[PDB]
A paper describes a structure:
Activation of the central complement component C3 (~1 mg mL-1) to C3a and C3b by classical/lectin (C4bC2a) or alternative (C3bBb) pathway C3 convertases plays an essential role in the generation of complement-mediated defence mechanisms against invading microbial pathogens. While the circulating C3a anaphylatoxin is involved in inducing inflammatory immune responses, C3b (reported normal plasma concentration: ~210 ng mL-1 but levels are markedly higher on infection and under certain disease conditions although its short half-life (< 2 min) makes accurate measurements difficult) facilitates opsonophagocytosis and clearance of immune complexes through thioester-mediated opsonisation of primary amine- or hydroxyl-containing antigenic and self surfaces. During activation in the fluid phase, the majority of C3 molecules do not covalently attach to surface-exposed hydroxyl- or amine-nucleophiles but instead the highly reactive Cys–Gln thioester moiety within the thioester-containing C3d domain (TED) of C3 undergoes hydrolysis resulting in the generation of C3(H2O) and formation of the C3(H2O)Bb alternative pathway (AP) C3 convertase. Of the C3b generated by these fluid phase or surface-associated convertases, only approximately 10% is deposited onto reactive surfaces, leaving the remaining 90% to react with water wherein exposure of the cysteine free sulfhydryl can lead to dimerisation of C3b and its subsequent breakdown products iC3b and C3d(g).
A crystal structure of wild-type human C3d, harbouring a cysteine at position 17/1010 (C3d numbering/intact pre-pro C3 numbering) (C3d17C), was obtained at 2.0 Å resolution. The structure clearly shows the formation of a dimer mediated by partial disulphide linkage of the thioester cysteine residues at position 17/1010 in both monomeric chains. The 2Fo-Fc electron density map at the C3d17C dimer interface shows that chain B residue 17C adopts a dual conformation with one conformer existing in an unpaired oxidized form, perhaps due to radiation damage. This indicates the disulphide bond linking the two C3d monomers can occur in a partially disconnected state which is consistent with results from size exclusion chromatography experiments suggesting C3d17C exists in a an almost equivalent monomer-dimer ratio in solution. Importantly, this dimer retains the ability of C3d to bind SCR domains 1-2 of CR2, the αMI integrin domain of CR3 and SCR domains 19-20 of FH. Staphylococcus aureus immune evasion proteins such as Efb-C, Ecb/Ehp and Sbi-IV are also predicted to bind the C3d17C dimer without any hindrance as the concave surfaces of both monomers are exposed and accessible.
Residue numbers in the entry:
A (entry chain B): 1 to 298
B (entry chain A): 1 to 301
Write the structure that this text describes.
Amino acid sequence: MLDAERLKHLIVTPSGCGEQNMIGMTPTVIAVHYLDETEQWEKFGLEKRQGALELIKKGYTQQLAFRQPSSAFAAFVKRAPSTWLTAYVVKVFSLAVNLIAIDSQVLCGAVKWLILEKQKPDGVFQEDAPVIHQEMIGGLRNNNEKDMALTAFVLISLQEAKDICEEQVNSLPGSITKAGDFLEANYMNLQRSYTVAIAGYALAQMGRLKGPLLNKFLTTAKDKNRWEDPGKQLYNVEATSYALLALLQLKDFDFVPPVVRWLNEQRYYGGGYGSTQATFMVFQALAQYQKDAPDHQE
Amino acid sequence: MLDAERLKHLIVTPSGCGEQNMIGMTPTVIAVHYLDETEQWEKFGLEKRQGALELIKKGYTQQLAFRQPSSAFAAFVKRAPSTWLTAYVVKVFSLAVNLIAIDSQVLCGAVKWLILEKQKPDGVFQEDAPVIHQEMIGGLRNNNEKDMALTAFVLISLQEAKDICEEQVNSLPGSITKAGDFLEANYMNLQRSYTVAIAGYALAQMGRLKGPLLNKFLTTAKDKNRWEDPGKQLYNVEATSYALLALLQLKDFDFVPPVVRWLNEQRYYGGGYGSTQATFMVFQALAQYQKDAPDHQELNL
Ligand SMILES: [Cl-]
Ligand SMILES: [Cl-]
Ligand SMILES: [Cl-]
Ligand SMILES: [Cl-]
């Protein structure tokens, strides 16, 4: 468990425009999420949650300034909308629904736009206006397997929004199936551990990670405890976090304890430059472990 | 004179939204302005000037994304417009008109909006939506003489746009007089050296810094060479630069050399967090000095 005494820096006041505001909202949202699930507010300071929640609501409200009439998001309203940023807003707001009031028309409008404007006939999600802060997208910044990585990223956002939006967005179940088809068709050709992990989570959420795909997912780990590529450590933390979430979806609780151990032994507590995806994902994944299998420990 | 070899950190790529983009635009605009006047492009490398102009045009074009329909500016289009930021864009664009193409409808639309929407019936300019980046407004930040300091700041911007805009904005001369009236009526009650300096320049531009007001302006200086809020180095560089511009308007060349010398002795070359106003003002003021006293004697530091 990441001790609350080491997480004070994650309580951040969001500011800036469409991208930077989300860079600021990210650590506060996910710190509250993780401190909640690990029952660490007595140590952190019980009275401090109210203020954190006010900062999350400020982040949410400020983000609406960058909601374009299409319901998509960009750094500023005169900039063409970003597929990735819109999917990231969906990912954050969906997780934050039990913390603050999230307008379902914002969330589901963003989902519908992604599907109707940015999914292609083969199921891929396409980015036409990349975020300026490329450091906020984690391992997706790498040029290789970008189609697969982004399609998995967006698909994960649709899945995390499905319960809220499935009655409001006609196109949602078919979009999920199409994206799933694309990932499944190309999974065995993947070479990056990062893509194996993020696409693995997306497929496992649909019950479509099995057979030789599931074997590729599991055997891609090094020392059965991490998904790693030659490159930035932060990308490996992010990848292993997506893999932990896929293991939990799979209920592979035997495999989980070494992965959790490796994540704790990285002594990574979020925050800093280029930390957005690693921070969201490591605390999302460890919170989900605490919720689902804290009894499985090394 | 600030040596061109010391200035290359002022050529920067502007980025971000309506406030940050101007934080980036400021050093490069004023660096080119200063290098032009002091004819230092040899030491710097004359091949570099075209690239700097392209960086200025990029800042200009990017800034237009944050021009709201009213012609006012804020950090983002859905934010309530800022009186200060709109006046600062007018200030920067007015000085950049000789470097790149500045659309006069953009510039004078902002001027007209300031007068029609943000000047009160007693001539004060009011800020209803302060900038998020309070570090970019210099010594106006936490300045308790708020109406005097902001009215002086906006008036100064109106004056630097007057030649371009008075033909398109027929309310500009009256707005200038009313702002000046407000400053002159309350100048003697000022206490902050910063406000004395910036309102001093605004009045001097109009020929209305005289008599006891002129005496207060001059005797507020310390050691006859600076306008000082103790411990506030960047504020003081900015304020003393406004004071130098005021002295040059007064043509008080007996007073000017020690002020120029103090500014040079700070070994301050702009740039860095919170440096926007100090950077714009010191290079504006020292360029005007070079322009007004072109054959002054070499500074022996
Ligand atoms: Cl941004
Ligand atoms: Cl609470
Ligand atoms: Cl905007
Ligand atoms: Cl900004």
